[PDB]
Structures are given as structure tokens and as C-alpha cells.
Amino acid sequence: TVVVTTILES
Amino acid sequence: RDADTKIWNGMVGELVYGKADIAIAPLTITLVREEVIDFSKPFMSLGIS
Amino acid sequence: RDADTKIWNGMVGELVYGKADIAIAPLTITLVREEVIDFSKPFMSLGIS
Ligand SMILES: NS(=O)(=O)c1cc2c(cc1Cl)N[C@H]([C@H]1C[C@H]3C=C[C@@H]1C3)NS2(=O)=O
């Protein structure tokens, strides 16, 4: 797969 | 960027170093980032408030 | 592109055909002209009013 990084923010 | 090191501590430091592939996040397109990563065209408009 | 002929005209078309070099103009970034030529990051944002 690919790596889809995020930050935890509403 | 770190002082004397330039190694990014955060999402883009995971994105630059081969760890992460795509970064879909509220990531501000500033000149420091775009000179060493790519951005697509923006998807949301905002400002300092 | 031309209506009924699909031949590229205009300021986009001049950049297509090699004659024009850069188009620093009130020109909207569009998917169909993204296909032929490159765009920068947008410098002004606006909506249909
Ligand atoms: N108010 S405006 O439309 O003239 C306008 C429009 C824009 C501004 C600044 C202003 Cl003042 N800066 C942004 C910048 C922030 C990051 C995203 C695009 C560039 C890099 N471009 S924009 O979104 O095209």
C-alpha cells in the first residue's frame, strides 16, 4: 500500500 | 527545522525520509517546506486569526 | 481549446506553441489547461460572485 500520514486534529 | 541539524520533527520529517509516502493533513505550504518537498495545489484557504 | 475544432488558442495556446514564455496575467488555474502547461501556486484566490 501507500503510507498516508496525518496529524491528529479535529 | 532543528538548529544545526535541519532534520524535521513532525509529519514532514516522516515524509522526507522515505518513511511516509503521502501527507494529507493541514500542512501549511511555506517556502521552507516546498523547497525540499513537493506540494499539490491547495485545497483550503485560511489565514492567521 | 477551440469550440468545434479543439485547437488550442489564446494565452494558453501561445505557451503551448512555444512563442510565449510566461503568462503573468489574471488567468484562472483550470484542470484542462493544467493538462497542457504548468502552473505555479496560486497568487490570488477568488470566487464566482
Ligand atoms: N487575497 S489574495 O487572493 O490576493 C491572496 C491569495 C493567495 C495568497 C495571499 C493572498 Cl493576499 N497566498 C497564498 C500562498 C500560501 C500558500 C498557498 C499558496 C501560496 C503558498 N497563495 S493564494 O492563495 O493564491
CSV table of C-alpha atoms and ligand atoms in Angstrom, one decimal:
chain,number,residue,atom,x,y,z
A,1,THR,CA,0.0,0.0,0.0
A,2,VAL,CA,1.0,3.6,0.3
A,3,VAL,CA,1.7,5.5,3.6
A,4,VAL,CA,-0.8,8.3,4.2
A,5,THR,CA,0.5,10.2,7.2
A,6,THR,CA,-1.7,12.6,9.2
A,7,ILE,CA,-1.7,14.7,12.3
A,8,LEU,CA,-4.4,14.2,15.0
A,9,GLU,CA,-6.5,17.3,14.8
A,10,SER,CA,-10.3,17.9,14.7
B,1,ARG,CA,13.9,22.5,11.2
B,2,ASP,CA,16.2,21.8,14.1
B,3,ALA,CA,19.1,24.1,15.0
B,4,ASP,CA,22.4,22.9,13.3
B,5,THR,CA,20.6,19.7,12.1
B,6,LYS,CA,17.8,20.6,9.7
B,7,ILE,CA,16.1,17.3,10.5
B,8,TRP,CA,12.4,17.9,10.7
B,9,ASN,CA,10.5,16.8,13.8
B,10,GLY,CA,6.9,16.2,12.8
B,11,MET,CA,4.9,14.9,9.8
B,12,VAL,CA,7.2,16.2,7.1
B,13,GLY,CA,10.2,14.6,8.8
B,14,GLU,CA,8.3,11.4,8.4
B,15,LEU,CA,7.5,12.4,4.8
B,16,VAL,CA,11.0,13.5,3.7
B,17,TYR,CA,12.9,10.5,5.0
B,18,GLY,CA,11.3,7.7,3.0
B,19,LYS,CA,9.1,6.6,5.9
B,20,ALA,CA,5.8,8.1,4.7
B,21,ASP,CA,4.5,8.3,1.2
B,22,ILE,CA,1.7,10.9,1.1
B,23,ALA,CA,0.9,13.6,3.7
B,24,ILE,CA,-2.7,14.6,3.6
B,25,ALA,CA,-3.0,16.9,6.5
B,26,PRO,CA,-3.5,20.6,7.4
B,27,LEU,CA,0.1,21.3,6.4
B,28,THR,CA,0.9,24.9,5.6
B,29,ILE,CA,2.6,25.5,2.3
B,30,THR,CA,5.5,27.6,3.3
B,31,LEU,CA,8.7,28.2,1.4
B,32,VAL,CA,10.9,26.2,3.8
B,33,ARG,CA,8.8,23.1,3.1
B,34,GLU,CA,8.3,23.4,-0.7
B,35,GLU,CA,12.0,23.8,-1.4
B,36,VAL,CA,12.6,20.3,-0.2
B,37,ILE,CA,9.2,18.6,-0.6
B,38,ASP,CA,6.5,18.8,-3.2
B,39,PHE,CA,3.0,20.2,-2.7
B,40,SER,CA,0.0,19.8,-4.8
B,41,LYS,CA,-2.2,22.8,-5.4
B,42,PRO,CA,-4.1,23.9,-2.3
B,43,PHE,CA,-7.4,22.6,-1.2
B,44,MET,CA,-8.5,25.1,1.5
B,45,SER,CA,-8.0,28.8,2.1
B,46,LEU,CA,-7.3,30.3,5.5
B,47,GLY,CA,-5.1,32.7,7.4
B,48,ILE,CA,-3.8,33.9,10.8
B,49,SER,CA,-6.6,34.8,13.1
C,1,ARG,CA,-9.3,24.6,-27.0
C,2,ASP,CA,-11.4,25.8,-29.9
C,3,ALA,CA,-15.1,25.3,-30.0
C,4,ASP,CA,-16.0,22.5,-32.6
C,5,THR,CA,-12.3,22.3,-33.6
C,6,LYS,CA,-10.5,21.5,-30.3
C,7,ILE,CA,-7.4,23.5,-31.4
C,8,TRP,CA,-5.7,25.4,-28.6
C,9,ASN,CA,-5.9,29.2,-28.8
C,10,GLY,CA,-5.3,32.2,-26.6
C,11,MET,CA,-2.7,32.9,-23.9
C,12,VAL,CA,-2.7,29.3,-23.0
C,13,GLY,CA,-2.2,28.4,-26.7
C,14,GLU,CA,0.7,30.7,-27.1
C,15,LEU,CA,2.5,29.0,-24.3
C,16,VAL,CA,1.6,25.7,-25.9
C,17,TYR,CA,3.1,26.6,-29.3
C,18,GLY,CA,6.4,27.8,-27.8
C,19,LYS,CA,6.0,31.5,-28.7
C,20,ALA,CA,5.1,32.8,-25.2
C,21,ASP,CA,7.4,32.3,-22.3
C,22,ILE,CA,5.4,33.2,-19.1
C,23,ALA,CA,1.8,34.4,-18.6
C,24,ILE,CA,1.7,36.6,-15.6
C,25,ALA,CA,-1.9,37.5,-16.0
C,26,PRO,CA,-5.4,37.3,-14.4
C,27,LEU,CA,-5.7,33.7,-15.6
C,28,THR,CA,-7.7,31.1,-13.7
C,29,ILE,CA,-5.9,27.8,-12.9
C,30,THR,CA,-8.1,25.2,-14.6
C,31,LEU,CA,-7.8,21.4,-14.9
C,32,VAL,CA,-8.0,21.4,-18.7
C,33,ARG,CA,-5.1,23.9,-19.1
C,34,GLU,CA,-3.2,22.2,-16.3
C,35,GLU,CA,-3.1,19.3,-18.8
C,36,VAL,CA,-1.2,21.2,-21.5
C,37,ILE,CA,1.0,23.5,-19.4
C,38,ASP,CA,2.4,24.0,-15.9
C,39,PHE,CA,1.0,26.3,-13.2
C,40,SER,CA,2.6,27.8,-10.1
C,41,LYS,CA,1.0,28.0,-6.7
C,42,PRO,CA,-1.9,30.5,-6.9
C,43,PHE,CA,-1.2,34.1,-6.1
C,44,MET,CA,-4.8,35.3,-5.7
C,45,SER,CA,-7.9,33.5,-4.7
C,46,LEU,CA,-11.5,34.4,-5.6
C,47,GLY,CA,-14.9,33.1,-6.2
C,48,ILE,CA,-17.9,33.5,-8.5
C,49,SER,CA,-19.8,36.4,-7.2
D,1,LIG,N1,-6.1,37.8,-1.0
D,1,LIG,S1,-5.4,37.2,-2.4
D,1,LIG,O1,-6.4,36.4,-3.1
D,1,LIG,O2,-4.8,38.3,-3.0
D,1,LIG,C1,-4.1,36.1,-1.8
D,1,LIG,C2,-4.1,34.8,-2.4
D,1,LIG,C3,-3.1,34.0,-2.0
D,1,LIG,C4,-2.1,34.3,-1.1
D,1,LIG,C5,-2.2,35.6,-0.5
D,1,LIG,C6,-3.2,36.5,-0.9
D,1,LIG,CL1,-3.2,38.0,-0.1
D,1,LIG,N2,-1.1,33.5,-0.7
D,1,LIG,C7,-1.2,32.0,-1.0
D,1,LIG,C8,0.2,31.3,-0.7
D,1,LIG,C9,0.1,30.5,0.6
D,1,LIG,C10,0.5,29.1,0.1
D,1,LIG,C11,-0.6,28.6,-0.8
D,1,LIG,C12,-0.4,29.3,-1.9
D,1,LIG,C13,0.7,30.3,-1.7
D,1,LIG,C14,1.6,29.4,-0.8
D,1,LIG,N3,-1.5,31.9,-2.4
D,1,LIG,S2,-3.0,32.4,-2.7
D,1,LIG,O3,-3.9,31.5,-2.0
D,1,LIG,O4,-3.1,32.5,-4.1
